[PDB]
Amino acid sequence: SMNPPPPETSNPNKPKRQTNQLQYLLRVVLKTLWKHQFAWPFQQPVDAVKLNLPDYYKIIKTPMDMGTIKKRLENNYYWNAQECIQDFNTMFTNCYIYNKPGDDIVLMAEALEKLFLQKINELPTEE
Numbered sequence: 001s002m003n004p005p006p007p008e009t010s011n012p013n014k015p016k017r018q019t020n021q022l023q024y025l026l027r028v029v030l031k032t033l034w035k036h037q038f039a040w041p042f043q044q045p046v047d048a049v050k051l052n053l054p055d056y057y058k059i060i061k062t063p064m065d066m067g068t069i070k071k072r073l074e075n076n077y078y079w080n081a082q083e084c085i086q087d088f089n090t091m092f093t094n095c096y097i098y099n100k101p102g103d104d105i106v107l108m109a110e111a112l113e114k115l116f117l118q119k120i121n122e123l124p125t126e127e
């Protein structure tokens with residue numbers, strides 16, 4: 001049918017702060033996941049029209065992708081790291097909800113999720 005608009009990435013009304021955990025999410029976590037061999041399906045919103053997936057946004061009501069996460073980090077959209085971590089987790093969960101277990105895209109998401117969790121384990125202390 002029609003794609004929804006992409007998620008909001010800037011909000012001038014939200015308060016802003018720069019923290020070492022948010023800097024780490026952008027400069028280490030997002031950077032490492034972006035370069036992974038399986039990252040390319042997750043680098044932009046699902047274009048359900050072009051990909052012939054008419055029921056995608058009937059099922060997935062909280063879409064998320066790493067292009068949006070990158071922009072949110074750049075625009076200081078997040079006040080804390082947990083908000084950004086939730087967005088990565090939403091991205092993976094959407095893939096698991098929509099696709100059959102064991103599909104190619106699920107294996108790709110599972111590999112990215114494993115790497116993501118390894119990097120979140122090394123999240124620096126707030127300081």
Ligand SMILES: CCOc1cc(C(=O)N2CCC(N3CCN(C)CC3)CC2)ccc1Nc1ncc2c(n1)N(C1CCCC1)c1ccccc1C(=O)N2C
Pocket residue numbers: 040041042044045046047051053095098099104105
């Ligand atoms: C920016 C580029 O975008 C994409 C491009 C191409 C592409 O090169 N061609 C080539 C082969 C084509 N033929 C048609 C006949 N056919 C039986 C075989 C394939 C299709 C179009 C494919 C998928 C893309 N983009 C995507 N974005 C999120 C997802 C996503 N694909 N996959 C795929 C990525 C690789 C494995 C699955 C999903 C596919 C279906 C449902 C959900 C999801 C999903 O969850 N995600 C996250």
Ligand SMILES: CCOc1cc(C(=O)N2CCC(N3CCN(C)CC3)CC2)ccc1Nc1ncc2c(n1)N(C1CCCC1)c1ccccc1C(=O)N2C
Pocket residue numbers: 051052098099100103104
């Ligand atoms: C947009 C759709 O995308 C793909 C679809 C399918 C597919 O049949 N499903 C998967 C989705 C299934 N749903 C899941 C949700 N549920 C509710 C309903 C059921 C239905 C059927 C397979 C591969 C895809 N996407 C792809 N994108 C680039 C590549 C690519 N496949 N191929 C294959 C395309 C055909 C030959 C090989 C590659 C495979 C391995 C390595 C590289 C490449 C490669 O080079 N390219 C360019």
Ligand SMILES: CCOc1cc(C(=O)N2CCC(N3CCN(C)CC3)CC2)ccc1Nc1ncc2c(n1)N(C1CCCC1)c1ccccc1C(=O)N2C
Pocket residue numbers: 037038104105107108
């Ligand atoms: C070197 C092996 O290679 C692959 C193997 C297999 C595989 O299990 N077979 C196939 C061979 C079978 N023999 C052959 C004859 N013999 C006598 C008996 C056994 C056994 C079973 C699947 C995909 C492969 N190769 C791949 N190359 C890039 C990509 C890629 N798969 N994935 C998948 C890998 C895991 C996650 C998804 C992609 C899939 C769809 C779209 C894009 C991409 C993508 O982005 N990349 C980077």
